[PDB]
Design a protein around this nucleic acid. Sequence first.
DNA 1: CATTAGA
DNA 2: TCTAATG
Length: 327
Amino acid sequence: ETLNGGITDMLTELANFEKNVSQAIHKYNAYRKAASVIAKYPHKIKSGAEAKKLPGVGTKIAEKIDEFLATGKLRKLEKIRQDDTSSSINFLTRVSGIGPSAARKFVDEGIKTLEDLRKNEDKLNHHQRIGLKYFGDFEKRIPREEMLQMQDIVLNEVKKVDSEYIATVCGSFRRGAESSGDMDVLLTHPSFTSESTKQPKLLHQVVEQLQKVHFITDTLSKGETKFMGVCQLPSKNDEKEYPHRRIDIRLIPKDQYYCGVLYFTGSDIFNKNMRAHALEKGFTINEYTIRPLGVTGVAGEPLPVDSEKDIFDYIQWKYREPKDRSE
DNA sequence: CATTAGA
DNA sequence: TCTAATG
Ligand SMILES: [Mg+2]
Ligand code: NA
Ligand code: NA
C-alpha cells in the first residue's frame, strides 16, 4: 500500500504504456500481474532477486526493480515520458470516443494536438466529434449542488411521461459525494421484466422527453436499453451558462432493479465485500440477482427482491444507507 | 462483460 | 461480421 508503492507504481506505468503506445497485450498483462503480486507482498522489496522469487516475477521485471531501487528512476520510463509519439497517444485518448487504436492511427496521420483534431473533424465519427466538441466540459467534475438540480429535472419528466416509471440516480452522488463525474440514471418500469419481450419505447419515450425540454442536448449512443448522452442545465437568467455533462440512462427489467441498483451504487469495495459475504451466508450476487448457493459446488434459483433491503436481509446484514456504502 | 457504432 | 470504445 506504501511499502511497495514506487515498485507497483513504476510497474503499472510500464504496463500501461505497453498496451497504449505498443500493442503488446502480453507484456502489458505481465507488468500487471507482477504489479499485482509485489502489491500484496508484506515486506519492503530489497532487490530484484527478492522480488524475483515471486510468481510473475521474471528476470525482466526483476531487473527494472533493481535499477529503480538503485537510482530513483528508470530509463525506459524516462524515455517513454519524453517520447512525443507516446505522449500524444496518451492525450488524444482523453477525447471521449478515442481509444488507443484510434489514437495511434491519428497520430500516424499526424493528428497529435487538439487543434489537429480540429482541422480534421472529418476523420472523426459522431461520438468523437462530440467528445471533441465538449472537451473542456467532459473533463470537469459535477458539483453536487448541480447534481441535485439535474436529478431533480430528470425525476420530473420521467414521472410526467408515465407515472409508473421508477428512476434512481446511482453512483457516488447516490453515496453522498461532493462532486461526481457524470450522471447515472437507472431505470425500470413494471411493464418490463426478465420475460415480457421488451418495450424499447420505454427507454425511448423518456429520452425524447428529456430532449423535448432541452435537458439532453446530444446523443453519443442510444439503443433499446442503454442511452448514452450529453445534458445541460438551463443556463439561468444569463451571465452564467452550464457545462455540458455526460449522462447515461439504462432500462432494467423491474425484476432486477435493486441488485443492479445495489451494485451501481457501489462502492467498488462495499460491493465486493458485501459480495464476499453473501457467499459465506450461502449465496451469490451479481449485477442482477441473488442466488441461493447449493452444496454440489454451485447452484441457481433467483431470489425475489423488492428493495435494497431484501438483498440485505437475504444475506442477513445491517441495512447500510448509501451514505455509508463507502467500503 | 455487455451494450452500441461502424465499416 | 468483427472490432472498438464506454462503463
Ligand atoms: Mg465518455
Ligand atoms: Na519467479
Ligand atoms: Na477517450
